[PDB]
Amino acid sequence: ITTAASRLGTEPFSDAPKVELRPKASREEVESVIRAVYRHVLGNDYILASERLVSAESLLRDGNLTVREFVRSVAKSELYKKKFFYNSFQTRLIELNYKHLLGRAPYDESEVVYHLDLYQNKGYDAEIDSYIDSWEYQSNFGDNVVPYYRGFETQVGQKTAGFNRIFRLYRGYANSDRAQVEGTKSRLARELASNKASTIVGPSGTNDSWGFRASADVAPKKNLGNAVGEGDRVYRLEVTGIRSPGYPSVRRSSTVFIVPYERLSDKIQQVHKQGGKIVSVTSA
Amino acid sequence: YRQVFSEHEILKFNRQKTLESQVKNGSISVRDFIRGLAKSEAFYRLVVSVN
Amino acid sequence: VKTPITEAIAAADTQGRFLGNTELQSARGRYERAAASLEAARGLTSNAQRLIDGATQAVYQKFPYTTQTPGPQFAADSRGKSKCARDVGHYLRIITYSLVAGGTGPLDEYLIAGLAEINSTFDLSPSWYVEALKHIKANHGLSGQAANEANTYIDYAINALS
Amino acid sequence: VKTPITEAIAAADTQGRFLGNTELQSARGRYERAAASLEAARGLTSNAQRLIDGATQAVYQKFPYTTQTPGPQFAADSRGKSKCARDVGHYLRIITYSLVAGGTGPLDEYLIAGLAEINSTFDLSPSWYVEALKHIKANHGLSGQAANEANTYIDYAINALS
Amino acid sequence: TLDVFTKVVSQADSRGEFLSNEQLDALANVVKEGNKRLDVVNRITSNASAIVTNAARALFEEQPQLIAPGGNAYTNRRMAACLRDMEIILRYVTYAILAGDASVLDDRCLNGLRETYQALGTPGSSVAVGVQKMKDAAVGIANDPNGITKGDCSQLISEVASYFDRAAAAVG
Amino acid sequence: TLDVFTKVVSQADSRGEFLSNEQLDALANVVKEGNKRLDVVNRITSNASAIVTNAARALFEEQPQLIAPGGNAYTNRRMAACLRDMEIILRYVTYAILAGDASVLDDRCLNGLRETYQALGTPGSSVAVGVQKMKDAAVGIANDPNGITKGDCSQLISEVASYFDRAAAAVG
Amino acid sequence: TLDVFTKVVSQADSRGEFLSNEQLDALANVVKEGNKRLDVVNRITSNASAIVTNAARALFEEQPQLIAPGGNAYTNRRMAACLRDMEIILRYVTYAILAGDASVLDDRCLNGLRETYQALGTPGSSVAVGVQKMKDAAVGIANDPNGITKGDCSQLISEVASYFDRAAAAVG
Amino acid sequence: TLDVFTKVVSQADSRGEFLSNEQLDALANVVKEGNKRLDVVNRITSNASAIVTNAARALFEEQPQLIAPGGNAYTNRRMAACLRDMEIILRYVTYAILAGDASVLDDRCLNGLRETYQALGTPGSSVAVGVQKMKDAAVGIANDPNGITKGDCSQLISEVASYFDRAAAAVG
Amino acid sequence: KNFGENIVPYQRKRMEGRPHNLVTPRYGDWRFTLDKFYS
Ligand SMILES: CCC1=C(C)/C(=C/C2=NC(=C\c3[nH]c(/C=C4\NC(=O)[C@H](C)[C@H]4CC)c(C)c3CCC(=O)O)/C(CCC(=O)O)=C2C)NC1=O
Ligand SMILES: CCC1=C(C)/C(=C/C2=NC(=C\c3[nH]c(/C=C4\NC(=O)[C@H](C)[C@H]4CC)c(C)c3CCC(=O)O)/C(CCC(=O)O)=C2C)NC1=O
Ligand SMILES: CCC1=C(C)/C(=C/C2=NC(=C\c3[nH]c(/C=C4\NC(=O)[C@H](C)[C@H]4CC)c(C)c3CCC(=O)O)/C(CCC(=O)O)=C2C)NC1=O
Ligand SMILES: CCC1=C(C)/C(=C/C2=NC(=C\c3[nH]c(/C=C4\NC(=O)[C@H](C)[C@H]4CC)c(C)c3CCC(=O)O)/C(CCC(=O)O)=C2C)NC1=O
Ligand SMILES: CCC1=C(C)/C(=C/C2=NC(=C\c3[nH]c(/C=C4\NC(=O)[C@H](C)[C@H]4CC)c(C)c3CCC(=O)O)/C(CCC(=O)O)=C2C)NC1=O
């Protein structure tokens, strides 16, 4: 990633080494081991001194325990259950879990079937045991290698719908995954089953345009008509937020416009008059 | 149709059936649809040739 | 992109702690190195067209093979020889970038990051460039200390090639 | 938000034409006007606590009604009198904003844009504020030309109230 | 727009068979309960502006950042927009009370409503605080007996507490 | 649309307190510097068409694929669209010069501008080559001392070079 | 993942009735044509790296902005990513050739592929130039007969030109 | 991560030509000014905890709703999170002081920072009150001369006041 | 500004006027009378 890393908030993760638990521990690494585990598994939510899992930390320091068996214990611990499982849906958990340990977003519907039946018959305490005792963990993450961010790199068996939904997961480096305006509901559960992939929107400060998230009844992703255009060069553009005159004039902000070609330039001025900011212009 | 054709016209032939289907889908805005009605020849042979 | 200043940043950011005295001395060191290096930077840009056309001919002298046999890989045609000054013209750019950056940062991303995968495809033999740079290693004409540090980034790109 | 500079912009942008001489003279006038206006800005912020507590008491003197009858609308309780310095404290802010902006811009959006709809709901009678400002109109103590322009934005908010 | 009479139609149309006498007897509650529907909406809309302004002092009681400078409900146009949207839920609630089924409220009030708070910047979850601070005043005005003869108001009333609970949950 | 006068307002409004006499003295540069703003925009728009056509020979000097057949700036309508967009940046630049703050250029010129070059096929990074090939002619025009009495107008030239540098960086 | 055998199942399952003898006779082409499928994919993947590197000199022939400085395919990591994606289409094409139906290519190659080019900045429509510059080399390698006995495999070949045409149209 | 040395590289790389002797002489200020950079960050981080706790009594001086019951900085975990974020800006500020260009602070401190205050409920604009209540203590500690030999430290103090001004403006 | 993006048009403020469709439409032989003279 060059010149998309500074916009999408991915330049800290692009050139970031892995922790690499050298098998004979010194003290200089193991606290930096534990910090980098708590940043990805808890998703940048900060640890308190009381909620440090002090007993668990000692075991991690000891040689017998692996990184692989330590990240089971923090996820089994009620700290991880306090921020996440306490205020989440079942499908909210599976997209969060697959973010927290494998480091991506679920690409197909078949893995959400196959985890909900195992959640009910066996429990959640063995449901976290299915993610850690998986082949996609063991191929890239060793027993001494910590988990890290695997959605950007090609990751040999990937989908291109999965690359769109990882920017849907976290809003950059600052985000703390309960730090998200869409709160208690789940995001990917709608776009998993209807199998359309939404627009990658960057995190903000670099990106001006952020307000748009995928609406409940959006216009089609491709249009079939000619869109009343002399020339068949349709464009589809998405807006963040419209502060026009009130309730009758703009009943709904962040809506999308399927617009033919000879009047694209006259409408981009019309969106900037209303206050709306363009998110994504795809062709159709 | 009523604003554009004044009720009597709706007929069968005058209505572009395709545009109505698109409007329900939401592919084309209503403002885009009246443009497609006014830039129709069922409007053009009706209003423009006589006026 | 790597820099001894930005190595003092990212090592301080993953620890989650402030800029202590043990990262400020890392940037202190770079400034001393940087003053010497810019003298190597002025030594190369003044000899831009001299070094490129000198080293491009230095490839053809040791390798008479690439000037004769027809093919899209070699430089029998003029468009090969036009793309000859493309590559070695681009090689001396990033060497001059790596001296002003003070690190191997821009040389890492711009040149040697995917270099082992292109040369397996386009039949660009890496022994061509590795002895192109050896002519630049000998004929830059620099002296003093800056002649050593300009010699450092040259044979860093050599070990990435071979 | 309105400004005589940004009126020269948006009138030039809807026409789709450049900044001619007929918009640069619009920003010329504001600059000359601004020097006189700032002097009214320093005249009000130095008398911040003097004007607010002077005008808040000036409401209660002409209106002894709002200090006596119980209700959430009036200021019989201290929380009403605490919210008394909220409103007139917020009134003098935007008047000082409108002088430094040179236009009625921030006074348009921040104060008088939805003011006719709140007062119909919360039973805030607009005759309370319209004579609060008349005390600020008389007791600001400004002189010269800046006394006129500070008097201009005051009775612009009056006509929006009544 | 739907009804309790026309959802029964569309439930029977997707089956595609005549309505049973077991089905119509359950619908015969509604023509008896239409005596009870028709005044509980009349009770709400009579005291509509009293509910809104009293619950405007309840979200603004608990969360005083909204008239704090820099707040999102801060300025006069913004605060007039709060009252513009404080009763835009009540008409869509009282539409669903008269219709008896929430398909009017779900395509006009809540359809994509959450999306704008992620677009504008106004806090979505704060509106869900004040909306169920209306229903304790809405139920509390609709339940108390004054003048009207005693009746089983409560069975219909649970419905009214359900519609505010649906609309508050689908905002925040 | 914003200003250097109204960003100071909105910075103070989000604090919500009166402006200090330390604050207004820094703003008193601008009423003195408004003598210097008002002609540097007048210098640019007087020679606006000379800048565009001379820098049309600079992107087309260095990258001759654009009038190559099959190029993206190739045909007459496409090349007329290049000149249609070669000075659509200059009005939005000179708006930001007069306003003094780049919030006009960032919601009308650069807001989603990069998105269309990924949509149409026209190279985004090539426009960033020719846009800062305007500023050496734009600053050069501003720099000459002929005519008006010598004054230090150089201080806001670093502002003018910043606005072209902002607009070129947010395209490619 | 789907097939020509299992789409017929799922077409019959959504009807929910036994397969007719009219249906199976049309499927009996595929067990005869499986002799013809199984080597046309073997012809492509044998010359897979020759197609990619020859078509790497075709997009870069016509559009020399890509190795221009500032281009999007410019640097070595970016150019290694081009070859990383120049044959990531060919495996997903040859999966659809063996399967016979494009439901593998449509959920793994093209599902949301257009979205990233609007995200990264890499030109979407330029990939659609070079992808159907592969199929004239892909068909041209698969069509010629050397060693294998002559047969009418033209009908199957049209399928192969359809899958490149589908994948190129859904990118740009 | 970027630098003043590597932004000059990337500015020259997107042009794609050797650096001029006019360019390097302007960069030769920085190797002279690296004597002046390296202790102004050392001045800040030496008194880092004194700045934070003194400016914790400045936002909490002016806005006493934060330790009011029901406030957003109210409880002990919330107040410990305030101090957790009161110096998470100072390390990202002092990173940008040492680097000299704010591309470290803009992808790690401010990239999407405003978004969480619209998500959590914590007031965004109140943090912008207290952050530029740090810089009058930050500049005021970095400017005074005791012991250290006199030098023109004023030149990059305007840089240091710019980085706090950038970080405060992009929060509220 | 007035009809917005997604409203059908309509006559605005027709309080003291005639509906447009009824008031305004789309529109705007000596040998016959001698032939009826023949009949
Ligand atoms: C006389 C008073 C006294 C005590 C108690 C003491 C404890 C002590 N415990 C240590 C380590 C330790 N102690 C534990 C203890 C535990 N791990 C768990 O999960 C359990 C909760 C718990 C056992 C019941 C572990 C795992 C370590 C080593 C951790 C590591 O090195 O990574 C060390 C580190 C070096 C060394 O042991 O030589 C000391 C000095 N020292 C003293 O002078
Ligand atoms: C804890 C809260 C919670 C719930 C309730 C939940 C439901 C849920 N129901 C599902 C499917 C389903 N659910 C049903 C349910 C029904 N079919 C009928 O006709 C009946 C009316 C009804 C049973 C009473 C069916 C048929 C499917 C699968 C449909 C399909 O895949 O085609 C799926 C799809 C994938 C999967 O199950 O793993 C989820 C996630 N998920 C949650 O997190
Ligand atoms: C016009 C000719 C042309 C092409 C095709 C092109 C591709 C191209 N693909 C890229 C990345 C990429 N491309 C993919 C593609 C895929 N991932 C998968 O698993 C799937 C198999 C596949 C989608 C169907 C991914 C994931 C990346 C980014 C990988 C990363 O950054 O870690 C990049 C890196 C930087 C950037 O995009 O701006 C370029 C330049 N450039 C060109 O000039
Ligand atoms: C029936 C479905 C429906 C709803 C609900 C709806 C709401 C709605 N509220 C809006 C604005 C707004 N809504 C609010 C509301 C609030 N801000 C606060 O701080 C308060 C806590 C809160 C009120 C309690 C505000 C402040 C705005 C103005 C935002 C702006 O001007 O940027 C807007 C756009 C701006 C406008 O025209 O005023 C819409 C569409 N529109 C619809 O069609
Ligand atoms: C198995 C036999 C069968 C067919 C074919 C069928 C079609 C069918 N097409 C529909 C809508 C539609 N169909 C179209 C089709 C098109 N629009 C265009 O401009 C193009 C010419 C064309 C696509 C090639 C559109 C736009 C709609 C929705 C129109 C609207 O709702 O406004 C609907 C409405 C509700 C629904 O789809 O669920 C049905 C039932 N139903 C059947 O049982």
Ligand SMILES: CCC1=C(C)/C(=C/C2=NC(=C\c3[nH]c(/C=C4\NC(=O)[C@H](C)[C@H]4CC)c(C)c3CCC(=O)O)/C(CCC(=O)O)=C2C)NC1=O
């Ligand atoms: C930034 C510009 C700005 C102003 C000025 C402003 C005023 C304003 N004052 C209000 C209430 C009020 N205003 C007052 C003020 C007064 N009532 C009296 O009895 C006195 C006569 C008078 C003061 C001199 C009082 C006491 C309330 C509370 C009334 C209530 O709660 O019903 C309210 C409604 C509730 C609120 O959020 O506190 C607004 C919106 N809002 C704004 O955004």
Ligand SMILES: CCC1=C(C)/C(=C/C2=NC(=C\c3[nH]c(/C=C4\NC(=O)[C@H](C)[C@H]4CC)c(C)c3CCC(=O)O)/C(CCC(=O)O)=C2C)NC1=O
């Ligand atoms: C506090 C809880 C409570 C409620 C809500 C309540 C309402 C209520 N309204 C009733 C009657 C009625 N209510 C209405 C009201 C109207 N009809 C119309 O067509 C008008 C539009 C509308 C008035 C605007 C009418 C017409 C009746 C007929 C019976 C009667 O006169 O009471 C009755 C008579 C007894 C019964 O229905 O079982 C009840 C119970 N009783 C309660 O205990």
Ligand SMILES: CCC1=C(C)/C(=C/C2=NC(=C\c3[nH]c(/C=C4\NC(=O)[C@H](C)[C@H]4CC)c(C)c3CCC(=O)O)/C(CCC(=O)O)=C2C)NC1=O
């Ligand atoms: C595909 C159809 C097509 C045509 C024909 C076309 C012409 C065309 N000729 C141009 C310039 C030019 N045109 C000419 C041609 C002439 N000037 C003279 O002195 C002679 C009288 C005359 C030739 C007989 C010259 C010399 C230039 C360069 C002028 C300049 O650079 O200012 C330019 C502007 C700069 C350019 O890209 O080179 C265009 C767009 N463009 C098109 O897309």
Ligand SMILES: CCC1=C(C)/C(=C/C2=NC(=C\c3[nH]c(/C=C4\NC(=O)[C@H](C)[C@H]4CC)c(C)c3CCC(=O)O)/C(CCC(=O)O)=C2C)NC1=O
């Ligand atoms: C006010 C802010 C604003 C801008 C800037 C804007 C640009 C804009 N540029 C367009 C096309 C274009 N723009 C260019 C520009 C260029 N080609 C090159 O090679 C050069 C690098 C460059 C000229 C310097 C070209 C070639 C097209 C048409 C490409 C095509 O249609 O194939 C279009 C397509 C339709 C139309 O123009 O009407 C828009 C809307 N619209 C806006 O609202």
Ligand SMILES: CCC1=C(C)/C(=C/C2=NC(=C\c3[nH]c(/C=C4\NC(=O)[C@H](C)[C@H]4CC)c(C)c3CCC(=O)O)/C(CCC(=O)O)=C2C)NC1=O
């Ligand atoms: C070459 C670099 C350079 C520039 C740019 C420059 C401009 C310049 N314009 C000045 C004055 C001025 N410039 C203007 C210009 C105008 N006022 C209007 O309202 C009109 C719309 C507009 C003319 C169209 C005016 C009115 C003055 C007043 C002072 C004077 O007469 O010089 C002065 C007087 C000294 C000063 O301002 O410090 C300077 C410096 N001086 C320089 O050395």
Ligand SMILES: CCC1=C(C)/C(=C/C2=NC(=C\c3[nH]c(/C=C4\NC(=O)[C@H](C)[C@H]4CC)c(C)c3CCC(=O)O)/C(CCC(=O)O)=C2C)NC1=O
């Ligand atoms: C999975 C391993 C496998 C392969 C690869 C395979 C291929 C294969 N292709 C065959 C035939 C054939 N294959 C072709 C293919 C073509 N001829 C053309 O001129 C076209 C360009 C091209 C199609 C595009 C033809 C024409 C025949 C003639 C015999 C037949 O119809 O099968 C046969 C018939 C039996 C034989 O050749 O001994 C085999 C074995 N069989 C296997 O078991």
Ligand SMILES: CCC1=C(C)/C(=C/C2=NC(=C\c3[nH]c(/C=C4\NC(=O)[C@H](C)[C@H]4CC)c(C)c3CCC(=O)O)/C(CCC(=O)O)=C2C)NC1=O
């Ligand atoms: C809801 C549970 C809860 C508690 C109890 C709590 C206490 C608390 N007390 C504080 C300060 C303080 N606490 C005290 C109290 C004391 N200091 C003394 O000298 C006395 C010995 C002692 C009282 C008996 C004082 C005087 C301060 C202000 C100190 C300062 O500003 O530095 C602070 C930091 C600043 C603040 O917001 O005011 C917290 C967070 N916070 C909580 O969220």
Ligand SMILES: CCC1=C(C)/C(=C/C2=NC(=C\c3[nH]c(/C=C4\NC(=O)[C@H](C)[C@H]4CC)c(C)c3CCC(=O)O)/C(CCC(=O)O)=C2C)NC1=O
């Ligand atoms: C170094 C980069 C970085 C930053 C900047 C960062 C900030 C940051 N502040 C957060 C929370 C928070 N931030 C604050 C800050 C404040 N609230 C107030 O009212 C005060 C005015 C102010 C302190 C002065 C608070 C109170 C929370 C917790 C909110 C809550 O728990 O509801 C969160 C959400 C996660 C969590 O709280 O555990 C993040 C990510 N995280 C990072 O990794």
Ligand SMILES: CCC1=C(C)/C(=C/C2=NC(=C\c3[nH]c(/C=C4\NC(=O)[C@H](C)[C@H]4CC)c(C)c3CCC(=O)O)/C(CCC(=O)O)=C2C)NC1=O
């Ligand atoms: C109050 C405003 C102010 C500041 C900030 C200031 C700093 C300052 N530091 C200086 C020197 C210096 N400062 C340092 C500091 C260090 N070098 C390292 O490698 C260490 C890591 C680090 C100490 C931890 C050094 C080594 C010098 C060399 C010159 C000298 O001894 O003063 C000088 C000498 C004169 C000059 O540079 O022009 C100045 C001005 N002077 C001022 O008036």
